[PDB]
Swiss-Prot record, chains A, B:
Gene name for this UniProt entry: tgt
Needed co-factor(s): Zn(2+)
Entry's Gene Ontology BP terms: queuosine biosynthetic process; tRNA wobble guanine modification; tRNA-guanine transglycosylation
Binding site for substrate: 92-96, 145, 192, 219
Lineage: Bacteria, Pseudomonadati, Pseudomonadota, Alphaproteobacteria, Sphingomonadales
Name the UniProt record assigns to this protein: Queuine tRNA-ribosyltransferase
Amino acid sequence: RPRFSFSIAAREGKARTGTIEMKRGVIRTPAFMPVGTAATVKALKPETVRATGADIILGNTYHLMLRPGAERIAKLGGLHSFMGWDRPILTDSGGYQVMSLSSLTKQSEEGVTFKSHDGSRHMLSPERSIEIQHLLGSDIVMAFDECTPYPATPSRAASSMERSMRWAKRSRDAFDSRKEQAENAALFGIQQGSVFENLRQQSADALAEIGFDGYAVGGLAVGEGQDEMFRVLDFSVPMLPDDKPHYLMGVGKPDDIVGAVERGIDMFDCVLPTRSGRNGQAFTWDGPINIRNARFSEDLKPLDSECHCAVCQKWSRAYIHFLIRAGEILGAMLMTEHNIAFYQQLMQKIRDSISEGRFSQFAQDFRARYFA
Amino acid sequence: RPRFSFSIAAREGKARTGTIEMKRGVIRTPAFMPVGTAATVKALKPETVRATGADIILGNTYHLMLRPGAERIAKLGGLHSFMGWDRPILTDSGGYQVMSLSSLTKQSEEGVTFKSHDGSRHMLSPERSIEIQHLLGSDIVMAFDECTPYPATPSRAASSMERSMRWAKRSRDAFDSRKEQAENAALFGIQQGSVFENLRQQSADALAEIGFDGYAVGGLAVGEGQDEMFRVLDFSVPMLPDDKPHYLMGVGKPDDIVGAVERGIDMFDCVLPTRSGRNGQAFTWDGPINIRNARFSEDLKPLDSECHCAVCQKWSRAYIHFLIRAGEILGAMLMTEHNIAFYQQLMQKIRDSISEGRFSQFAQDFRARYFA
Ligand SMILES: [Cl-]
Ligand SMILES: [Cl-]
Ligand SMILES: [Zn+2]
Ligand SMILES: [Zn+2]
């Protein structure tokens, strides 16, 4: 297999389906990436993650750089060996979680210094982020950027987008100056610009001039709501190179995924299926349910009536209701496996419907039933 | 298969190896039963419990009668169906955990009333305990007894043993008066008498006169220490019928198991491998280790160098150290699977060595290395 090859096999409107071939495996797109918060997709063995259909997982750099530490992971053979997942891993840059989770943060044109959420002090710059992702052995490396809160004034959105584009060039040069990384991994750039079309265009132009293996739409799913997110995607995705993957970071609910695919997105990640699964929310084709609700206490049906996952083959809603309300680890395990499997089945139905030229009908049927 | 058939295939000194055949499966003895605290062996799917080699699990009646409730479990098809374990289940009577965990307890010759550890009020008697175990669909039912704290005066030990023997007859009659239970399950009686040989003899005689399918040695592993436990086993086990299984409740550490087998015990249960696994203690042939210790932070070896379990085939001490110190669910999963697998490998080595007439040598070799 090549370092990186994205091929589009079929298209319907703005939606695309295809494959990314990388050294560690093939990624079917549109793709959903389960999130490994710190070297584990919570409550699942890697073999179970794979059995649900996932082709790639996301690793969070911020957590790993604090514990166990990037240098330690490298000494132990890299993230894939450490956690036991041998397929592709996309790593984020660490920048978002520095701003959302850490303390004592000091931002500058060089990068960010911050106190660990142990109080230890640390630094992150484009160069150091790319280095950490190298030490982890990431297959898809994210450029380090400066995130823009929502809402943002035009001036602040412009300043942060401009800094992010300067940092995108620094990220590109850092990645290219490490032969082993440049030859074996891929690098994605991140479009910024908040909700402003002109800034989104300037950002897309800057990223395309630098050149990346894929392009993320950053700065969304941060409080603007679905209507606004879709409005921004409507004009933003067409600005990116058509022949490279489009990655919508941190999205999302099933309907958000469907609508984003309709707008040209190829890749997704979110903690919703894992985190909300441990909290008791199960996804079904008839909408989400909270399994803790008393109405499920004697319900012998599976979580979802059509789901092909091992949880739905073997255990009832009533049992999982009991486990979650008792705080049992097996409850978290079963809810998480089902939710990740549901997400993968959603992505498979999306891919097949695009490949068959019936994705518009799928989206309509999906919504009618999910929101009934 | 029959309702119950215990066959002894080989003997060495007081140690025995053989099988219990029951409708739901064969139990190889000496046997270790993983504990399901409330309809789950914590952090393991039933298929994983089976893959470690377990033939039977223990279910705690006290917890189940509080949540989800015995009648609810019966309405849902019984414990086996509810939790997804189709092999034999031994249920305790609930009496011990009423005294250790509940509040507002009031004891009488009829039974015990108590407040749930939700403050709801409940009752337990020989008849109600046997009924609950029936509603769960238990394969091996434990007679309901009155536990004796350690230390106990001779008078108090006698009074509690005598009550327990009256309750053993009530348990026998309750079990026999339910045709479906009598025809498909087995009933074990519990020897009491604290550390006193004469009381242990009176108890054994009373239980043998009633007649049971197996006999537990109750009232040990409650603070007396291994020397005293072994001293009591030395005289107590020979008092029980030789041709029925001997069950030492709530034992124990690996060396306790080996010494108890040397004294004629055939069955064991303990929370040590599961509970202490979640806490970071891993069993190895060179003794236990606490995986959280900093010495394991970069140790690429498996938990144990010989263990054939899936955890030791796939992940390092360093990774599990990280998971446990991070509070990750996968850490609990991996530690528990390894520890239960280690216990099953111990039982297999015990069975094979007895079957080959080299168990005395095994016990000596085991100790020399485990305590090095
Ligand atoms: Cl998560
Ligand atoms: Cl436990
Ligand atoms: Zn399912
Ligand atoms: Zn092992």
